[PDB]
């Protein structure tokens, strides 16, 4: 209840009681080498060759710690020597063309077998690239999901992902088989009852095997363990402390001291191997129900003992035995006689100064973790800036003048008599 | 032994005793920047520039927390003007060829200095690629081997790989120097005695220094600590519990209670700073040897105390004070009078329901962790599909007709008289 | 002091006293997807597509555990049929040129639109490459900085980097707000008071949210807790042990026993929720000040109790009740009567053998962790080795002979009469 805080007794903890047993075994088999494409191309043989190599460099130590555990007549002749020499000049132009047509034809299948020789080059780079990145993502994924197991041979608390994969996704089913509620997983994992340890590792196949161990818990209703602490308050004796156990468990109208030696405690759940309770004095039970007039006090204390304590980011102090100075909101703190002890939290004070120390009962820290990616523009020297049109045009035009200069020639024959 | 389980006393733990001391220091110096090729090419300057940058973004915080701690006469003339104009048409075809031969020659050293300009491009990409992947593998390798040390300044349990590297591979030698057996490494690492902490980090060289601390253990034979717990069994008094210590150590015929406050316990090994034993009542020693008739009982118990407990995934319960209902294999469970307490495990029951809770004494979970890699086929627009043969052929053929049309011309002169 | 070691009492621990409270909350919001370049190019859509995919495959499990919690006349005619056929041979050479000039022009815009088609290909690969590597560095960076939080839903000890980012770099300011000194951070983080747990995760935006919890500590000067242990030394009784508490706290001239149940201990700092001290016998206080003649002894011990213990990599043993054999430096060890107990460390012995075990008080292990990167030289088939100069030259030269063979023709006409 609450009136028990009128005798220096304050409830610090309140959690449910559970009984567990490590009677659930599993076996997660991890395939270090991902499933390569059906194409089976040896173009990704480069990124993988290095990936598989960094696996042996990373797993061997782990596997090691397991394996060991007339006058005109001269003109008619001159004309002959003129056209017999003209044909001599045409036969050469023909050789220059019949050999240049080869220099162009030879250059055809060249640039063709060089662009087609690049079509298979760039094709490989894109594949190698994708694989190189996709393969790195996996190695940085395993060292996160199964890090704890890779980094140590002995039992290590599993990873959510590792467990998520174990249940095959269907989590609500896994929990039910163990007897765990939805609002109890956070504490279940944070208890070290979900451990795992490597068992068999193959260097060749790169296939890691892990042995999982899960607990079977049985919740106990109507039974809740309560943690109790006490401060110093003046009484009939004078400056004494209330006498109450540290941990108690209640069922209906039965209250007894709980031995937390057989149990693993959390923030809101206690998983116990066994339950051992002890009978408490009748004067104690009477008090814990509300009868504050039943609690016994004693001077079991020294001079260096503190008149306060910490509870859930708060400070519970006796402000009549110590001046509670509230800094941020100026003024001295106190409480009605109904409560022998004052509770100071964030709702009434941000900075407090007690006898000796100065605790800060408030604070806020908001930060952002991001990354600014900047890519460099590597100017590629490769450019398509070949301008041979100035020469090409002078040909498409020079040919025109060669055709008409011939037309005049061929038309000068239309005027020949005989 | 086993007959002690006839008085409600059950052996839960059984481990060897060890004496240890943190008198072994080491120093692992990690080279964050790998050994670059002797070629010293500045083609891998891109992947490294970013890698070295993410190291300072990842290590600075760590280093920070350390730095601060006639009528025919007209024909003879007409023929002249016919061939003087024909040569006029040949001189132009020559200019068109002598300028096209340049347009082709200029295009030669172009595509040549563009394919050769690509031969050094693709060459760089392949290098950059390999480095980019190889360098990522290392960063995802260090955050796994030396993660614990990078993530925290204070002492942190080393990684198998970190230790494996420390011993230089030869592990059997390292253990011998510390006095550790082969079948004792699993517990040795899982004790937190193999810790390490960063000491000196250089931002420039990217060279991390870690201080290792190893224990020197001395095994004690003939001495084994045994953990003992007790349940409630009806006796001369009626509904009482046997009185026996929690931890005891035996040597030959000497049995005494062991103080486990100076020791770190494991699954099968206890590493102790010291050994403190206490003498136990003669009535106790007599019992632990086999004389069950010597053990004393007492009603040190409450009403909320459990009539059972958990042991190695099993449930040891008194099935005469509580109805043990076996679910999976229907039927009530009990045991011969020879054993006051019943042991229920997987070999006799898969699901049990006791007074209050229902524990599951069996379960199997097999899962597989893999990754399906699928690469995309980026169709490269670059193709070698230049078909200039239709035009090329029309030349290799048109030249033939130009050669024979000239042969007729040159043969029409063989029939000239003078 | 030191004279207390003349009664078998040795100081093992010496740390400062602190009062803490979890009254400091923070919220680190992590942007899983980095800030892409302003260019917004879809050329990095490949590496990111896979990166974002491995995030959902890595975070969903985490988010899941939160969402649910004449005769010559014949000659004048023969000459006509000679040049009319010669022009017939020139008109064809013209067609072969006017069609080859097209085969070259068509090949111009081809290799041009294939090199320019590659200029945008290589450009993309370089971008994709840089992004692929830069993006991998981030995923291997987060699984290290926020690994503990990604791997578990419940509270987990933060990472230096995570905290460094929280304080926005300015660390000296953060500590001051909590009341932590510079030479106290190592112990502060290694206490589990700097915890954090995921609270909200968005699958779409890939934005992780973590709730941070920091303590507010108030140092206590003039007060230092001291850990005390005792060995067996012969006295008036004979073979007994000194009687002194395990932990004590002193303030000025006030010495009392300290209850370390409310406190978290470290290597040099104790962070306590509260301080509970107990009064000790006057005979005890007198001794701890120096009056060794005031300490009481008792035979509270068994036969299996050890005559030694471990302290900071050393062994404190009674070398008059046990023969201390120093191995490395041969000889038996002992100490002046002034000190009832001998302290054996590295400064006086490297290997020791006591009654039962043989501890090694010295050792050094230096190792180096590095990586040798070797890149492969993938010979690119793409080469610029087109040598069409042998054919090109035969044209540039054949044209010369065609020009002069025509010059003779055109000069044979200069000798024509009419
Ligand atoms: C990954 O690399 C390791 C490197 O050791 C390879 O291990 C070899 O496995 C073959 C069989 O596949 C054995 O015959 C060899 O003895 C191993 N190498 C040596 C010399 O130890 C392994 O093959 C690689 N995995 C794959 C499938 O690529
Ligand atoms: C990364 O880039 C972002 C976006 O440009 C930067 O965001 C800035 O944040 C600061 C506060 O920390 C603001 O004052 C600026 O206005 C923001 N800039 C803009 C234009 O958005 C951020 O500074 C960069 N991160 C670092 C530290 O390099
Ligand atoms: C890795 O990157 C860091 C970024 O800080 C580099 O640090 C520089 O180191 C040089 C000496 O090599 C110093 O002169 C500079 O002051 C440092 N940079 C600054 C401005 O802090 C470091 O050089 C890089 N490492 C290598 C070898 O590439
Ligand atoms: C990845 O690919 C593998 C191989 O194709 C898939 O394996 C399937 O596994 C399921 C059971 O989980 C079987 O029912 C199928 O027959 C398997 N397929 C084949 C053809 O082998 C697997 O499903 C894929 N992983 C996921 C979940 O995407
Ligand atoms: C990263 O990948 C996830 C894969 O689930 C994407 O999730 C989708 O988010 C869109 C909105 O952006 C939803 O409409 C879809 O329903 C989600 N996919 C499905 C089918 O679950 C997410 O968009 C990706 N992130 C980015 C920004 O690329
Ligand atoms: C990686 O390369 C380095 C540098 O070559 C090697 O360094 C050698 O280290 C050993 C001792 O471990 C020396 O004996 C050699 O002289 C060193 N070699 C040289 C030339 O420096 C190292 O061996 C390589 N690492 C491994 C194990 O492959
Ligand atoms: C009709 C003609 O003979 N002129 C062509 C013209 O058509 C063409 O565009 C140019 C470039 O290819 O070459 C020349
Ligand atoms: C003999 C001859 O002049 N014809 C050639 C032939 O040999 C060659 O294959 C073709 C393509 O190069 O051009 C033409
Ligand atoms: C002057 C002349 O007509 N000869 C040219 C020469 O100049 C040139 O270097 C060669 C290769 O391009 O072709 C031919």
Coordinates of C-alpha atoms in Angstrom, one line a residue, chain C residues 57-345:
Chain C
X57 CA 16.2 -8.0 -42.9
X58 CA 18.2 -6.8 -39.9
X59 CA 15.8 -4.4 -38.1
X60 CA 12.4 -6.0 -38.5
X61 CA 13.1 -8.6 -35.7
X62 CA 14.1 -5.7 -33.4
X63 CA 11.0 -3.6 -34.3
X64 CA 8.9 -6.7 -33.9
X65 CA 9.9 -7.1 -30.3
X66 CA 8.8 -3.5 -29.7
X67 CA 5.6 -3.3 -31.7
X68 CA 4.3 -6.1 -29.4
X69 CA 5.6 -4.8 -26.1
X70 CA 39.6 7.1 -144.9
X71 CA 42.1 4.9 -143.1
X72 CA 42.9 7.4 -140.4
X73 CA 39.2 8.1 -140.1
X74 CA 39.0 4.7 -138.2
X75 CA 41.6 6.1 -135.8
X76 CA 39.7 9.3 -135.0
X77 CA 36.8 7.0 -134.2
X78 CA 39.0 4.5 -132.3
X79 CA 40.2 7.3 -130.1
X80 CA 36.6 8.3 -129.4
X81 CA 35.8 4.7 -128.3
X82 CA 38.9 4.8 -126.2
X83 CA 38.1 7.9 -124.1
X84 CA 34.4 7.2 -124.1
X85 CA 35.3 4.0 -122.4
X86 CA 38.0 5.7 -120.2
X87 CA 35.3 8.0 -118.8
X88 CA 33.2 4.9 -118.4
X89 CA 36.0 3.7 -116.0
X90 CA 36.2 7.0 -114.2
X91 CA 32.4 7.2 -113.6
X92 CA 32.6 3.9 -111.7
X93 CA 35.6 4.9 -109.6
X94 CA 33.4 7.9 -108.7
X95 CA 30.5 5.7 -107.6
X96 CA 33.0 3.5 -105.5
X97 CA 34.2 6.7 -103.8
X98 CA 30.8 8.3 -103.3
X99 CA 29.7 5.1 -101.6
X100 CA 32.8 4.5 -99.6
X101 CA 32.7 8.1 -98.3
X102 CA 29.3 7.0 -96.9
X103 CA 30.7 3.8 -95.4
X104 CA 33.2 6.0 -93.6
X105 CA 30.8 8.7 -92.7
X106 CA 28.4 6.1 -91.3
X107 CA 31.3 4.6 -89.3
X108 CA 32.0 8.1 -87.9
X109 CA 28.8 8.6 -86.0
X110 CA 29.0 4.9 -85.0
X111 CA 32.2 4.8 -83.1
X112 CA 31.3 8.3 -82.0
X113 CA 27.9 7.2 -80.6
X114 CA 29.7 4.2 -79.1
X115 CA 32.5 5.9 -77.3
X116 CA 30.1 8.7 -76.2
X117 CA 27.8 5.7 -75.3
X118 CA 30.6 4.5 -73.1
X119 CA 31.5 7.9 -71.6
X120 CA 28.1 7.6 -69.8
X121 CA 28.7 4.0 -68.9
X122 CA 32.0 4.2 -67.1
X123 CA 30.7 7.4 -65.5
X124 CA 27.9 5.4 -63.9
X125 CA 30.2 2.6 -62.7
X126 CA 32.4 5.0 -60.9
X127 CA 29.4 6.5 -59.1
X128 CA 27.9 3.1 -58.3
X129 CA 31.3 1.9 -57.0
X130 CA 31.9 4.8 -54.7
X131 CA 28.3 4.6 -53.3
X132 CA 28.6 0.8 -52.9
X133 CA 31.7 1.1 -50.7
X134 CA 30.6 4.3 -48.9
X135 CA 27.3 2.6 -48.1
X136 CA 28.9 -0.6 -46.8
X137 CA 31.1 1.4 -44.4
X138 CA 28.0 2.9 -42.8
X139 CA 26.2 -0.5 -42.2
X140 CA 29.4 -1.9 -40.6
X141 CA 29.6 1.4 -38.6
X142 CA 26.1 1.2 -37.1
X143 CA 26.3 -2.5 -36.1
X144 CA 29.3 -1.3 -34.1
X145 CA 28.1 2.0 -32.6
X146 CA 24.5 0.8 -32.0
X147 CA 25.1 -2.9 -32.1
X148 CA 24.1 -3.5 -28.4
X149 CA 20.8 -1.7 -29.1
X150 CA 20.1 -3.5 -32.4
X151 CA 20.9 -6.9 -30.9
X152 CA 18.6 -6.6 -27.9
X153 CA 15.3 -4.8 -27.0
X154 CA 16.0 -4.5 -23.2
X155 CA 18.6 -2.1 -21.7
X156 CA 22.1 -2.5 -23.0
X157 CA 25.4 -0.7 -22.1
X158 CA 25.8 2.1 -24.7
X159 CA 28.9 2.5 -26.9
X160 CA 31.5 5.2 -26.5
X161 CA 30.6 6.4 -30.0
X162 CA 26.9 6.4 -29.2
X163 CA 27.5 8.5 -26.1
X164 CA 30.1 10.7 -27.9
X165 CA 27.4 11.5 -30.5
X166 CA 24.9 12.1 -27.7
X167 CA 27.1 14.9 -26.1
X168 CA 27.5 16.3 -29.6
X169 CA 31.3 16.0 -29.2
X170 CA 31.6 18.2 -26.2
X171 CA 32.2 15.6 -23.6
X172 CA 33.6 17.7 -20.7
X173 CA 30.2 19.5 -20.7
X174 CA 28.2 16.2 -20.5
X175 CA 30.2 14.9 -17.6
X176 CA 29.8 18.1 -15.6
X177 CA 26.0 18.0 -15.9
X178 CA 26.1 14.5 -14.4
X179 CA 28.8 15.3 -11.8
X180 CA 31.5 13.0 -13.3
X181 CA 35.2 13.8 -13.3
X182 CA 37.6 13.2 -16.3
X183 CA 39.4 10.3 -14.5
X184 CA 36.2 8.6 -13.7
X185 CA 34.7 7.9 -17.1
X186 CA 36.3 4.5 -17.6
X187 CA 34.5 3.2 -14.5
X188 CA 31.3 5.2 -15.2
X189 CA 30.7 3.4 -18.5
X190 CA 31.8 0.0 -17.1
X191 CA 29.0 0.0 -14.5
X192 CA 26.0 -0.5 -16.7
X193 CA 24.5 2.9 -15.7
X194 CA 24.9 4.2 -19.2
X195 CA 22.2 2.0 -20.8
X196 CA 19.9 2.5 -23.8
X197 CA 17.0 0.7 -25.5
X198 CA 15.1 1.1 -28.8
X199 CA 11.7 2.7 -28.6
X200 CA 10.4 3.5 -32.1
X201 CA 11.5 2.1 -35.4
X202 CA 10.0 3.0 -38.8
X203 CA 10.3 0.4 -41.6
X204 CA 9.6 3.0 -44.3
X205 CA 11.9 5.8 -43.4
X206 CA 14.4 3.4 -41.8
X207 CA 14.7 5.7 -38.8
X208 CA 15.7 4.1 -35.5
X209 CA 14.9 5.7 -32.1
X210 CA 16.7 4.9 -28.9
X211 CA 16.0 5.9 -25.3
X212 CA 19.1 6.8 -23.3
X213 CA 19.4 6.8 -19.5
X214 CA 22.2 8.4 -17.7
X215 CA 23.0 8.6 -14.0
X216 CA 23.6 11.7 -11.8
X217 CA 26.5 11.0 -9.5
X218 CA 27.7 13.0 -6.5
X219 CA 31.2 12.3 -5.3
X220 CA 32.0 12.0 -1.6
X221 CA 35.4 13.2 -0.5
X222 CA 37.3 12.3 2.6
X223 CA 35.2 9.1 2.4
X224 CA 36.9 6.0 0.8
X225 CA 35.7 2.4 1.0
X226 CA 38.5 -0.1 1.8
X227 CA 38.2 -3.9 1.2
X228 CA 39.9 -6.1 3.8
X229 CA 40.7 -9.8 3.9
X230 CA 42.6 -11.9 6.4
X231 CA 44.9 -14.9 6.4
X232 CA 45.9 -17.4 9.1
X233 CA 48.7 -16.5 11.5
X234 CA 49.8 -18.2 14.7
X235 CA 48.9 -16.3 17.8
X236 CA 48.3 -16.8 21.6
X237 CA 45.7 -19.4 20.7
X238 CA 47.7 -21.0 17.9
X239 CA 47.0 -20.9 14.1
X240 CA 44.2 -18.4 14.0
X241 CA 42.8 -15.6 11.8
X242 CA 42.3 -11.9 12.5
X243 CA 38.7 -10.7 12.9
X244 CA 37.9 -7.7 10.6
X245 CA 35.0 -6.7 8.4
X246 CA 35.2 -7.1 4.6
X247 CA 34.3 -3.5 3.6
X248 CA 34.8 -0.3 5.6
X249 CA 34.3 3.4 5.0
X250 CA 36.2 6.1 6.8
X251 CA 35.4 9.8 7.4
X252 CA 38.0 11.8 9.3
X253 CA 38.2 9.8 12.6
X254 CA 35.0 7.8 12.1
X255 CA 35.4 4.2 10.8
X256 CA 32.4 1.9 10.2
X257 CA 31.5 -1.2 8.2
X258 CA 30.0 -0.5 4.8
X259 CA 27.1 -2.4 3.3
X260 CA 28.0 -2.8 -0.3
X261 CA 24.6 -4.4 -1.2
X262 CA 23.1 -1.0 -2.3
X263 CA 26.2 -0.2 -4.4
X264 CA 27.7 -1.1 -7.8
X265 CA 31.5 -1.6 -7.5
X266 CA 34.2 -1.0 -10.1
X267 CA 38.0 -1.0 -10.3
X268 CA 38.4 2.4 -8.5
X269 CA 34.8 3.7 -8.1
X270 CA 31.7 2.6 -6.2
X271 CA 28.4 4.0 -7.3
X272 CA 25.8 3.5 -4.6
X273 CA 22.0 4.0 -4.4
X274 CA 22.4 4.5 -0.6
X275 CA 24.9 4.3 2.2
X276 CA 24.3 1.9 5.1
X277 CA 27.1 1.7 7.8
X278 CA 27.4 -0.4 10.9
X279 CA 29.2 0.2 14.2
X280 CA 32.2 -2.1 14.8
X281 CA 33.7 -3.3 18.1
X282 CA 36.1 -0.8 19.8
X283 CA 38.8 -3.5 19.6
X284 CA 38.4 -3.4 15.8
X285 CA 38.7 0.4 15.4
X286 CA 41.7 0.5 17.6
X287 CA 43.5 -2.0 15.3
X288 CA 42.6 -0.4 12.0
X289 CA 44.3 2.8 13.2
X290 CA 47.5 1.1 13.9
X291 CA 47.1 -0.6 17.3
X292 CA 47.7 -4.2 16.1
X293 CA 47.7 -5.2 19.8
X294 CA 44.0 -4.6 19.8
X295 CA 42.8 -7.1 17.2
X296 CA 41.1 -10.3 18.3
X297 CA 41.8 -13.7 16.7
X298 CA 39.9 -16.9 16.3
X299 CA 40.2 -20.4 15.0
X300 CA 37.3 -19.9 12.6
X301 CA 38.8 -22.1 9.9
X302 CA 38.9 -25.6 8.4
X303 CA 41.7 -27.9 7.3
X304 CA 41.2 -27.3 3.6
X305 CA 41.5 -23.5 3.9
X306 CA 44.3 -21.9 1.9
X307 CA 47.2 -20.2 3.6
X308 CA 47.3 -17.6 0.8
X309 CA 45.3 -15.5 -1.6
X310 CA 45.4 -13.5 -4.9
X311 CA 45.7 -9.7 -5.1
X312 CA 46.2 -7.7 -8.2
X313 CA 48.2 -10.4 -10.0
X314 CA 50.1 -11.2 -6.9
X315 CA 50.0 -13.8 -4.2
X316 CA 49.9 -12.9 -0.5
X317 CA 50.9 -16.0 1.5
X318 CA 52.0 -16.9 5.0
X319 CA 55.5 -18.3 4.3
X320 CA 56.0 -19.6 7.8
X321 CA 53.0 -21.9 7.6
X322 CA 53.8 -22.9 4.0
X323 CA 57.1 -23.3 2.2
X324 CA 57.1 -20.6 -0.6
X325 CA 59.4 -22.0 -3.4
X326 CA 60.4 -19.4 -5.9
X327 CA 61.0 -21.1 -9.3
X328 CA 62.4 -18.7 -11.8
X329 CA 64.6 -17.0 -9.2
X330 CA 65.7 -20.1 -7.1
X331 CA 65.4 -19.9 -3.3
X332 CA 62.9 -20.0 -0.5
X333 CA 60.9 -16.9 0.3
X334 CA 60.3 -15.3 3.7
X335 CA 59.9 -12.0 5.5
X336 CA 61.0 -10.1 8.6
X337 CA 59.0 -10.8 11.8
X338 CA 57.6 -7.2 11.4
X339 CA 55.3 -8.6 8.7
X340 CA 53.5 -11.8 9.7
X341 CA 52.6 -12.3 6.0
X342 CA 54.8 -12.2 2.9
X343 CA 53.8 -10.5 -0.3
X344 CA 55.1 -12.1 -3.5
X345 CA 54.8 -10.2 -6.8

